[PDB]
Amino acid sequence: SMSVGFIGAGQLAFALAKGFTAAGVLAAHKIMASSPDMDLATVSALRKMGVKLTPHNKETVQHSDVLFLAVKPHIIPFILDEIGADIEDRHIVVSCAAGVTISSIEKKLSAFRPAPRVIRCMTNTPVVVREGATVYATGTHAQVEDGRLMEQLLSSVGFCTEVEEDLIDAVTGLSGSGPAYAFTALDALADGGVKMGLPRRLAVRLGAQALLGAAKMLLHSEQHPGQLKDNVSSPGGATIHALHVLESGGFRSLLINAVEASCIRTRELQSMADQE
């Protein structure tokens, strides 16, 4: 029942706006988004939603109480310089950008007005179906109710928890990049279904249902994923035969490699940002 803004009108702005309005926590008309190119396909999607669109980032700031920064990490410093003087006492600035530290944001903004209210989050694209995974850290001058408000809002579109900021790059490598790992696994599983004689449409549907179902089981269980895996693996059966071939390929190591590589690239990019 408050005004929300997005600097950037891309994949994430759309996913979050769609999630929030689907959840009934925000009205489309109370959301404004800005982008230099008002022609992107995400901008058309946001427009069909009933979100207000403008090329001017200063309008989005003036409209908003909660302001999401939804631009690529290297654009963050530029927009902070652009609208730093327009930030007001009322604003909660929520950065969604991978890698970008609360300290870097607070430093740019504090030049214009002291005590900016800053929250850093990492979320993912499934907020669009209200099954996101979101973490946030509160800044130096965030009020206690600011983190509570943020958890309330982001909980409407998935799992939300507060973390120490020093965990966010790792979360980025796991749940931020995680959907892409799943989409790749699902395409491959469907290819396997197809190789064994299934129609593609049926293979995609069953693969995706299998992954959704397994994930829900784990979330609702008190047991270790190893135990749930044990329960599927009948002695001498089809499943244990398949698990062996995954093991022989170092399947588990690949997913460990993936989380590590995404985390390291996130950290590495911010080092370049900090040096620059």
- Pairwise CA distance, residues 130 & 23, whole Å: 7
**Residue 30 annotated as lining a ligand binding site:** no
Q: Which residues lie closer than 8 Å to 86 by C-beta, 6 or more apart?
A: 58, 61, 62
The answer to whether residue 205 forms part of the interface with a copy of itself (CB under 8 A) is: yes
The answer to whether residue 57 forms part of the interface with ligand NAD (CB under 6 A) is: yes
- Pairwise CA distance, residues 258 & 260, whole Å: 5
Distances (CA, A) of 132 to 70, 93, 257: 16, 20, 23
Nearer to a copy of itself, 71 or 92 (CB): 71
Nearer to a copy of itself, 115 or 272 (CB): 272
Nearest approach, Cβ of residue 72 and ligand NAD (Å): 5
Nearer to a copy of itself, 90 or 244 (CB): 244
Tokens of 165: 């900021």
The answer to whether residue 271 forms part of the interface with a copy of itself (CB under 8 A) is: no
Strand pairing class (92-95; 31-34): unpaired
- Pairwise CA distance, residues 58 & 108, whole Å: 16
Nearest approach, Cβ of residue 55 and a copy of itself (Å): 17
**Cβ contact 119:148 at 8 Å:** no
Nearer to a copy of itself, 85 or 246 (CB): 246
Q: Which residues lie closer than 8 Å to 5 by C-beta, 6 or more apart?
A: 31, 32, 33, 34, 60, 61, 63, 64, 66, 67, 68
**Which residues ranging from 207 to 266 are in contact with ligand NAD (CB under 6 A)?**
232, 234, 237
The answer to whether residue 96 forms part of the interface with ligand NAD (CB under 6 A) is: yes
Nearer to ligand NAD, 28 or 182 (CB): 182
Nearest approach, Cβ of residue 195 and ligand NAD (Å): 14
Considering only the stretches 51-59, 86-94, 106-114, 163-171, report the one whose residues sit in contact with a copy of itself under the rule CB under 8 A: 163-171
**At 141, which amino acid appears?**
H
- Pairwise CA distance, residues 187 & 84, whole Å: 44
- Pairwise CA distance, residues 234 & 228, whole Å: 12
Nearer to a copy of itself, 81 or 230 (CB): 230
Considering only the stretches 28-36, 57-65, 81-89, 154-162, report the one whose residues sit in contact with a copy of itself under the rule CB under 8 A: 154-162
**Which residues ranging from 84 to 113 are in contact with a copy of itself (CB under 8 A)?**
98-99
**Residue 250 annotated as lining a ligand binding site:** no
Binding footprint of ligand NAD on the chain (CB under 6 A)? 7-13, 34-37, 40, 42, 57, 70-73, 75, 78-79, 96-98, 123-125, 176, 232, 234, 237
